[PDB]
Design a protein around this ligand. Sequence first.
Ligand code: ANP
Ligand code: ZN
Length: 294
Amino acid sequence: AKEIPEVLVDPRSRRRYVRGRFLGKGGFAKCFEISDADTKEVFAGKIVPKSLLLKPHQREKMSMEISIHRSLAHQHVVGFHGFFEDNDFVFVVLELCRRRSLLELHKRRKALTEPEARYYLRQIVLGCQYLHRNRVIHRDLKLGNLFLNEDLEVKIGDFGLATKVEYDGERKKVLCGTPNYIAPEVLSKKGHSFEVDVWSIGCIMYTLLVGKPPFETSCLKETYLRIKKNEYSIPKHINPVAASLIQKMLQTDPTARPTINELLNDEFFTSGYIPARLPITCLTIPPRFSIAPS
Ligand SMILES: Nc1ncnc2c1ncn2[C@@H]1O[C@H](COP(=O)(O)OP(=O)(O)NP(=O)(O)O)[C@@H](O)[C@H]1O
Ligand SMILES: [Zn+2]
C-alpha cells in the first residue's frame, strides 16, 4: 500500500489542503479532516487509492458516484466542494459533518423521543425529496449515510449506490452493491425505482422510534426471508400515528407506499411537536423539551 500525501494539491484550482484528523473508513475510501492552507476552511476529504480502482467497472461506479454527487446542492445533502487525483489517489472534497452519523447517535441513545425522530425524519424526507425531484434514487439510505453537522442538521451522504432515472417509468433491474435497508422488490429482483428510498426511510423511522431495525436476525438471508414475507411487528408503546406511517412505508407492494412528496403532509408531522433545533446534549441525553428552566 502507498502512503497518502500530507498536503493534497488540486492543480486546476491551485488550492492546497493539509491532511488533518482521521474521521473513519468505508469500502475503498479513508476519510480525513482537510484544511485549505489559504482560507483555513475545513472539509471532509474522502481519499480512494487507485490500487483498488484497477477494474473499469469499479472505476465506472466511482465516476458515476462523483457525476451524481457533484450535481446536487441542498441543505440536507452533504455538500460536494470538489474532486481531483494524482497517480495513486482520487480525492473528493465534501462538507465536513463534525457530529458523525445517526448510526453513532442510535448506538448511544437507542430509541429516540418522538419529537427527535420527527425532527430528523423531516430533514431526511426534505433531502430525499430534493433527490427524487432531481431523478436521483439513493438506494442505500441508512443511519450511517445520514451525517450530522455541528448544529445536528442531517446531511444525506454516500451516493455510491445512487442512480439517475433516465425516463418516466424506468425500472432499474441491477443494484450492484448490498443496501442495509434493502426493499422487497430488490430482493425478488422484480425491478425497482424511487420507492426503495421510501422503504428505507420506513426502516429508519422504525429504528429511531423502536431502538432496533424492523427485520433484524443473526443471518442476513433469514432477514431477507422476513422482508420478503413482510414479517415485522411494531411494539404497542409506539403511538398509533407513528405506527400507521411506518405501516404505510413498509408495504411489500412499492405502488402501495406513499411517495416522498406525501410524507411531510402525514399526521405524524402535522399533528406533532417538531423542534426547530436540537442542542448537542441530544447526542447523549434524552431531551424533555421543557417550557422553561428550573
Ligand atoms: N462529510 C463527512 N463528514 C464526516 N465524516 C465523513 C464524511 N463523509 C464520510 N465520512 C466518514 O468516512 C466514512 C466513509 O465514507 P462514506 O461516505 O460513508 O463512504 P463508504 O466508504 O461507502 N462507507 P459506508 O457509508 O459505510 O458505505 C463515513 O462512514 C464517515 O465515518
Ligand atoms: Zn457490478
